[PDB]
Amino acid sequence: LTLESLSNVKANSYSEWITQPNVSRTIARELKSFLLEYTDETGRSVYGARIRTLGEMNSESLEVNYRHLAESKAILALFLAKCPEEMLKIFDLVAMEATELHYPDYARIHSEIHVRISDFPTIYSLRELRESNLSSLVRVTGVVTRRTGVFPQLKYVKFNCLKCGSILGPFFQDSNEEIRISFCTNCKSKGPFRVNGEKTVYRNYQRVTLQEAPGTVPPGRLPRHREVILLADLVDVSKPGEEVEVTGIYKNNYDGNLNAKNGFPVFATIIEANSIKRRVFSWTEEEEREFRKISRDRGIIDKIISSMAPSIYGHRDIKTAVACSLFGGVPKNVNGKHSIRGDINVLLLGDPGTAKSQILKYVEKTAHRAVFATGQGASAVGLTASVRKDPITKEWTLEGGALVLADKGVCLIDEFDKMNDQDRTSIHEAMEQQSISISKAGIVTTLQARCSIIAAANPNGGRYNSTLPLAQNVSLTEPILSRFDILCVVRDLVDEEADERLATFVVDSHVRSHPENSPIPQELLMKYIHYARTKIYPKLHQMDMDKVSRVYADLRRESISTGSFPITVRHLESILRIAESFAKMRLSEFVSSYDLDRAIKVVVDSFVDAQKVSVRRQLRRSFAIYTL
Amino acid sequence: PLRDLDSEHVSKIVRLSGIIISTSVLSSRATYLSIMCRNCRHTTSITI
Amino acid sequence: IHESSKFIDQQFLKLQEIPELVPVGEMPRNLTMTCDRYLTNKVIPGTRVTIVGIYSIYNSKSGVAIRTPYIKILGIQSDVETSSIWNSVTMFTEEEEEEFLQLSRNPKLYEILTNSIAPSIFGNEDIKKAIVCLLMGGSKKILPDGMRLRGDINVLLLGDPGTAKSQLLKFVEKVSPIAVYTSGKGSSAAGLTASVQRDPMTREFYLEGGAMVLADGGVVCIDEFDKM
Amino acid sequence: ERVFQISFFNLPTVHRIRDIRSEKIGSLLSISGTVTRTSEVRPELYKASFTCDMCRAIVDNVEQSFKYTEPTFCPNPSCENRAFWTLNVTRSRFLDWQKVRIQENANEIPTGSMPRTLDVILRGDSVERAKPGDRCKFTGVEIVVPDVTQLGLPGVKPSSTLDTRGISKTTEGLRSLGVRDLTYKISFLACHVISIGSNIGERDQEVFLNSLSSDEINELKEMVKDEHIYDKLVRSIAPAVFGHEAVKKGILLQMLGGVHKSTVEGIKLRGDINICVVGDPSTSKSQFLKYVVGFAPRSVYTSGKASSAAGLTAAVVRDEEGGDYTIEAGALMLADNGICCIDEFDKMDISDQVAIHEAMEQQTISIAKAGIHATLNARTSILAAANPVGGRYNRKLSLRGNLNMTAPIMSRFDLFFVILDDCNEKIDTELASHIVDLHMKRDEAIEPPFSAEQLRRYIKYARTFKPILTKEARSYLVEKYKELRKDDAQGFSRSSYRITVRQLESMIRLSEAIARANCVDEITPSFIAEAYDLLRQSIIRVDVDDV
Numbered sequence A: 001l002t003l004e005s006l007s008n009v010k011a012n013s014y015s016e017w018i019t020q021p022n023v024s025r026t027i028a029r030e031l032k033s034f035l036l037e038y039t040d041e042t043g044r045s046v047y048g049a050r051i052r053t054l055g056e057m058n059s060e061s062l063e064v065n066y067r068h069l070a071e072s073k074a075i076l077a078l079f080l081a082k083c084p085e086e087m088l089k090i091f092d093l094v095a096m097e098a099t100e101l102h103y104p105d106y107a108r109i110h111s112e113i114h115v116r117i118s119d120f121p122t123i124y125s126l127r128e129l130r131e132s133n134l135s136s137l138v139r140v141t142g143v144v145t146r147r148t149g150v151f152p153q154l155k156y157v158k159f160n161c162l163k164c165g166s167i168l169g170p171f172f173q174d175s176n177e178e179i180r181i182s183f184c185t186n187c188k189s190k191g192p193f194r195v196n197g198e199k200t201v202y203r204n205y206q207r208v209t210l211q212e213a214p215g216t217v218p219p220g221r222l223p224r225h226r227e228v229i230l231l232a233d234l235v236d237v238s239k240p241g242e243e244v245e246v247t248g249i250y251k252n253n254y255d256g257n258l259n260a261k262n263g264f265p266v267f268a269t270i271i272e273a274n275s276i277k278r279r280v281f282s283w284t285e286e287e288e289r290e291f292r293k294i295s296r297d298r299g300i301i302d303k304i305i306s307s308m309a310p311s312i313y314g315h316r317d318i319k320t321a322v323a324c325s326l327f328g329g330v331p332k333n334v335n336g337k338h339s340i341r342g343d344i345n346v347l348l349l350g351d352p353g354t355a356k357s358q359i360l361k362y363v364e365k366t367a368h369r370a371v372f373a374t375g376q377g378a379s380a381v382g383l384t385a386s387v388r389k390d391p392i393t394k395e396w397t398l399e400g401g402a403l404v405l406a407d408k409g410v411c412l413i414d415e416f417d418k419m420n421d422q423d424r425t426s427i428h429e430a431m432e433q434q435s436i437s438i439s440k441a442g443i444v445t446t447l448q449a450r451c452s453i454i455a456a457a458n459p460n461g462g463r464y465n466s467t468l469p470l471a472q473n474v475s476l477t478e479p480i481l482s483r484f485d486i487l488c489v490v491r492d493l494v495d496e497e498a499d500e501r502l503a504t505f506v507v508d509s510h511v512r513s514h515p516e517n518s519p520i521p522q523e524l525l526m527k528y529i530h531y532a533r534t535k536i537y538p539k540l541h542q543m544d545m546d547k548v549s550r551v552y553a554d555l556r557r558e559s560i561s562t563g564s565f566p567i568t569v570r571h572l573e574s575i576l577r578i579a580e581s582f583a584k585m586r587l588s589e590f591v592s593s594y595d596l597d598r599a600i601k602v603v604v605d606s607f608v609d610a611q612k613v614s615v616r617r618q619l620r621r622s623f624a625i626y627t628l
Numbered sequence B: 001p002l003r004d005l006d007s008e009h010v011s012k013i014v015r016l017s018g019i020i021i022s023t024s025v026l027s028s029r030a031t032y033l034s035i036m037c038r039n040c041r042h043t044t045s046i047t048i
Numbered sequence C: 001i002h003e004s005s006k007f008i009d010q011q012f013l014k015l016q017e018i019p020e021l022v023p024v025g026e027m028p029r030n031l032t033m034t035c036d037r038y039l040t041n042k043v044i045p046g047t048r049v050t051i052v053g054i055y056s057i058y059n060s061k062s063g064v065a066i067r068t069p070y071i072k073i074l075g076i077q078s079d080v081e082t083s084s085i086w087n088s089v090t091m092f093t094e095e096e097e098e099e100f101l102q103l104s105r106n107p108k109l110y111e112i113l114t115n116s117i118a119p120s121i122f123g124n125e126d127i128k129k130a131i132v133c134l135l136m137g138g139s140k141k142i143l144p145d146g147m148r149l150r151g152d153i154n155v156l157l158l159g160d161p162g163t164a165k166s167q168l169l170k171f172v173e174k175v176s177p178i179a180v181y182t183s184g185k186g187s188s189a190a191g192l193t194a195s196v197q198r199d200p201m202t203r204e205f206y207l208e209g210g211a212m213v214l215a216d217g218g219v220v221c222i223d224e225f226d227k228m
Numbered sequence D: 001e002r003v004f005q006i007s008f009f010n011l012p013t014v015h016r017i018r019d020i021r022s023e024k025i026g027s028l029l030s031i032s033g034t035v036t037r038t039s040e041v042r043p044e045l046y047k048a049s050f051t052c053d054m055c056r057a058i059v060d061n062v063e064q065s066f067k068y069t070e071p072t073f074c075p076n077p078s079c080e081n082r083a084f085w086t087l088n089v090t091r092s093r094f095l096d097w098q099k100v101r102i103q104e105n106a107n108e109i110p111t112g113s114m115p116r117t118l119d120v121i122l123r124g125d126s127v128e129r130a131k132p133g134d135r136c137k138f139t140g141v142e143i144v145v146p147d148v149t150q151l152g153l154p155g156v157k158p159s160s161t162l163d164t165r166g167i168s169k170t171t172e173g174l175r176s177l178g179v180r181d182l183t184y185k186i187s188f189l190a191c192h193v194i195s196i197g198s199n200i201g202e203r204d205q206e207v208f209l210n211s212l213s214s215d216e217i218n219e220l221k222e223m224v225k226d227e228h229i230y231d232k233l234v235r236s237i238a239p240a241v242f243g244h245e246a247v248k249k250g251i252l253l254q255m256l257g258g259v260h261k262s263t264v265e266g267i268k269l270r271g272d273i274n275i276c277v278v279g280d281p282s283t284s285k286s287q288f289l290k291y292v293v294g295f296a297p298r299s300v301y302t303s304g305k306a307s308s309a310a311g312l313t314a315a316v317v318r319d320e321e322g323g324d325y326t327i328e329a330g331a332l333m334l335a336d337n338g339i340c341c342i343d344e345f346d347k348m349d350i351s352d353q354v355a356i357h358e359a360m361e362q363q364t365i366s367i368a369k370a371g372i373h374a375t376l377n378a379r380t381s382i383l384a385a386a387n388p389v390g391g392r393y394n395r396k397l398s399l400r401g402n403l404n405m406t407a408p409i410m411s412r413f414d415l416f417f418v419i420l421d422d423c424n425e426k427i428d429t430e431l432a433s434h435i436v437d438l439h440m441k442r443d444e445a446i447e448p449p450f451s452a453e454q455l456r457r458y459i460k461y462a463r464t465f466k467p468i469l470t471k472e473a474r475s476y477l478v479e480k481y482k483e484l485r486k487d488d489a490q491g492f493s494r495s496s497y498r499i500t501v502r503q504l505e506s507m508i509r510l511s512e513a514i515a516r517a518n519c520v521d522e523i524t525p526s527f528i529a530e531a532y533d534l535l536r537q538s539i540i541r542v543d544v545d546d547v
């Protein structure tokens, strides 16, 4: 037939029209022609290149643009829009033949090609779906809330007869309904036939709950939700909590005896997803060369610190501590017996309104594995490990908590002072031995909790006191204060010049944020940080020894002079650990004397800031050589 | 990995890792059972 | 006919992905597994295992043709072996028996054992000697009147922060055949002493755990002993 | 064929939810009620298509009378069996279906009774015209729905036996019969839905002005040209309250609010203004909240003790011990893009305070209970009334000493209004005269410059404007923030609470609200100065005993 004759319809509906064999083979021929000959008048066929790429990477998905099919064969685009199931089946057979022409043995390897329609023009929200959209193609936006596990769904079903024992040839399984068998062809009987899963072929199946994104929801109304079924190649592509656009067939669930609660013949609906599009710390070979180029620069550490938290103004010491915590040191197990922690723990103790929460959020966006937890609030991952039974599923799960989940990563704890006893024991154990022991519900085990910790806390009474020292200013007991490497005390002393630039920064953010209206870019910095944590592992040599013992001996006796809380071995280890993170920002295999001096500066500045006002003025002049 | 299991692994030997969270009690399955007809008294054995 | 029928043992296990590598917003995913005969009772819950098995199919009476996956266990490998009185081994080969006898004939066995205790800790030689004495224990006495005399040695280390007493506790935890390291208030989800709770399925009393009981016949290292 | 629906409206009488009687079943009738829960729009089997199981020929356009039916005619001559069919969902014809749950209105509730609910079904174009938390008038038919719940109720329940009098039988051998229960509950099927205002008496301004007629646009613009419009507005807020002009200013700015801004990072800047009123007992703090809930649209009034964490944000509800779970919106969702009035905030326990400040920072409500995972909007302003520790407000202590609320509660309030009771002869004399005059004269002792209807019209007009800062405005704002910080630095402990950056952001928000009050698109430095003065006299100086 012809395209104009395809536009005219003889059957009652479009589905029965496409169902006719002459019309179906005409559609298949026209779709094969369109797949073969289509070009953008640039001398290149995009679909031939796509077929070659999917053949070379061994993929069962062919991404087909809807605009290309619409401009060339408008009636076929209309047929795909209104009756997508059988149209997609036909064009899947067409694309399978097109791939077969390119690769002859691709059929025995895969035997299935799924066509993913891209750039469907009309976009529906979840609240405006009606029955007119049923059995039609729809493109909707939404945020994924939860996803099930991947299940095997029958694809090529193979049966065996109980009377004879013979295995009867495979049948394709429709995804819409269950298929059954009534004849044996060997016994010529209608006897009981059993499915054997050994010879049956399966495809992946997943269910995803999609809700309307809260920004698009009208004010008084609730966000609507739908169930989206993801097939074999589409499973586990959408992490819960991310916003996607799904194109698929809007259809009805079939359930026994409908719904007895309503009193009306009411059907549940789903979206059978044809395609998923999303609205990664992988570096290429060129990106590694660019990393070496930017790390060769002398002011790489200054530039990294300045790139820390662009929304935060004027807090250079906090940004330096964040840079050390993100880059981290080298954990070392010497001869098996003795273990030394190699990740920096930072505690931001500050008065309210000092933007600690924004810093924690920046670290969460920046770090590879960052887990946010809070002592005061409830809508967060808990810090304590547990074994819990689902009240619906009746199936137990072991959760390690935020500290175990942030293993080889970052744990960001907001409201550090407001914990209960169980959380305090959990973070105490995690900072003590980097593990969490659980003996509950028959499970006795130890989970690895080698997580760097960045915490935010407030002083007692809502304001820091300079005359009192650090231990009196917090409810935190001394052993949990000792485990932190960097202790950033932040107070907003009223200085007119500082308040002027801070207010100017806030107002300029407000003005640029209005709808009617040196730093490394963050995408590059994120991969640079991930590369440094897994590739460098800086080391130090034996001739650098004579200086660190020199300064540390000059440290402790000064702490003897004023009677403050002492410099222990932990301060020396914090010096040697922070220096291994400064050599990671330089991407250097050795730890230099300049990185070591900068680490000494950070540790001494954190020690002096933690003192009372009487001790601080004496300690500042004695260590002015190290602070510079 | 447990979440990288696929329909391509169905009815095939897989090597995989994890933590065991529960072990049930031991059930008793029949390997050899001798059976007798109720009224016929025909005696048969089934080996599993 | 049950008196002439034969039976074996079947066990259901549940394997979960390790909680260290789980997406933050997702419940960890698990699988039901079946073992039989000599593969049963070879693993306790909490053990990290490698498993060779058949990824298999069953139908449970959410999709027209959906099957729940499960594993028929063919082999279990315990990556690490937990230490307790029940899992302790009493058998000794002849070569290690003779090798340990060559240790006892050394007049400086005491010195080399004290030097082997925490080599990366400077000083505290008396504490290291006391740790050697604590690790051995003493002769236990059971008397004809029934009054039991203990032989285990308890050692307290009071002192200033940053003096490697916690590292000594960790080293004793590592070197002891059976050892549990906890704080005074216990662990994150493992209590101190003994916990007697009810069975999660049958509601009957059982011993959930505890530091001092799990390390029976061993050493309990209690850090921050004052806060309890 | 197109499905046509007739919607009747303007019935002479509207019936209360408790006036529903069995005599009106199958009759056109009007009810009013508060929408508490709404369901997803679902397809309903209107005209089904079946195939006979052994004929295997298609039939269509079989009408469905409520519960699911199958035909017994089968005009195909192939079969001799009527009962056996199967239904295909693809060829079937469907309709819009929504079940919305409505509740008795507060004034309609009898003296000691609890409110009772009713499930009303919307079909066709009437779906989604009902929203949780508003008062709707439904016109439709009173229908009856099968109910298995009434099994254990006392009284004789009607049953339905098949009559066997004209059936010839033989006792040939080889006596079972089927009986079904007739138990029902009354439901409503509404053809027309109209939303009455939740008050006693759409973002684009071009859309809003088209709804008003030209004559009412004339008084709207006439209020616009008034040079003393701010004084009229602040005097028209809560005329029952005598004095307290600063609280009326703050409440007017809360009803106007600020603009919601989002940066390139993705963080959201809150435009809602939160007010907390603290002070001595019987200083008319509850009068402000009762005025706001009765006046402002999409506003709820809650007590601190009577509230719950699920009742304030959202609750997952078990229904009829059935496997389905539902979500009912809490107080902050019912007041989304409105004001939630929380009286006796100090009496609220710590868990509910945590659950509500989570919505105060995040502007959202997270649900992870049971099998329901959802994020809901909570873009609501908060007007709270609190009592200090010990009843009286202590002059010696700070603001944090008097209040039992958490620091996350206290930091997010833009304005704290401390109303102190001082016994002076004059002010007590005019206050007593005003209150007794209210009791004597009822409505005509209230003389606002603007009526409630025109005030709501002006506020709805003013909310369409989105003010922007000017070049001089930014510099004046920075200088005002520096003056605030220097004043606290000089005051030390004499200040009630210290100015941080959050107070600068609240001053920006208040300046935007003031610019909305005067219906200007650009913020004047005078408006910033007025916001500065309001925030300055919001803070009171702490008295210190002499040494």
Ligand SMILES: Nc1ncnc2c1ncn2[C@@H]1O[C@H](COP(=O)(O)OP(=O)(O)OP(O)(O)=S)[C@@H](O)[C@H]1O
Residues within 6 Å of the ligand: A311, A312, A313, A314, A315, A351, A352, A353, A354, A355, A356, A357, A358, A458, A502, A505, A506, D411, D501, D502, D505
């Ligand atoms: N130096 C700064 N640079 C930029 N913004 C700042 C700065 N200091 C404060 N802010 C702003 O002030 C506000 C403080 O909010 P949060 O950081 O959430 O509160 P916080 O600092 O965590 O203190 P809490 O929560 O009361 S203990 C935010 O809007 C910040 O953007």
Ligand SMILES: Nc1ncnc2c1ncn2[C@@H]1O[C@H](COP(=O)(O)OP(=O)(O)OP(O)(O)=S)[C@@H](O)[C@H]1O
Residues within 6 Å of the ligand: A340, A479, A482, A569, A570, A573, C120, C121, C122, C123, C159, C160, C161, C162, C163, C164, C165, C166, C167, C168, C223, C224
């Ligand atoms: N003599 C030492 N030799 C080697 N490392 C030492 C020595 N003294 C302290 N350290 C190190 O100092 C760090 C502090 O650990 P510990 O001293 O064990 O903590 P602790 O302060 O003794 O325990 P507390 O009292 O509960 S805080 C560890 O990294 C030790 O390796």
Ligand SMILES: Nc1ncnc2c1ncn2[C@@H]1O[C@H](COP(=O)(O)OP(=O)(O)OP(O)(O)=S)[C@@H](O)[C@H]1O
Residues within 6 Å of the ligand: D240, D241, D242, D243, D280, D281, D282, D283, D284, D285, D286, D287, D288, D386, D387, D431, D435
């Ligand atoms: N300034 C005022 N103008 C008019 N009526 C007032 C004024 N102050 C008090 N009243 C009346 O005194 C009574 C106080 O009622 P409320 O508003 O409940 O007091 P309150 O300020 O909320 O104090 P608490 O916290 O409830 S004890 C009411 O009858 C008010 O009408």
Ligand SMILES: [Mg+2]
Residues within 6 Å of the ligand: A356, A357, A414
């Ligand atoms: Mg904060």
Ligand SMILES: [Mg+2]
Residues within 6 Å of the ligand: A479, C166, C223
């Ligand atoms: Mg210690």
Ligand SMILES: [Mg+2]
Residues within 6 Å of the ligand: D285, D286, D343, D344, D385
């Ligand atoms: Mg009151």
Ligand SMILES: [Zn+2]
Residues within 6 Å of the ligand: A161, A162, A163, A164, A165, A166, A184, A186, A187, A188, A189
């Ligand atoms: Zn057969």
Ligand SMILES: [Zn+2]
Residues within 6 Å of the ligand: B037, B038, B039, B040, B041, B042
């Ligand atoms: Zn027999």
Ligand SMILES: [Zn+2]
Residues within 6 Å of the ligand: D052, D053, D054, D055, D074, D076, D078, D079, D080, D081
């Ligand atoms: Zn028929």
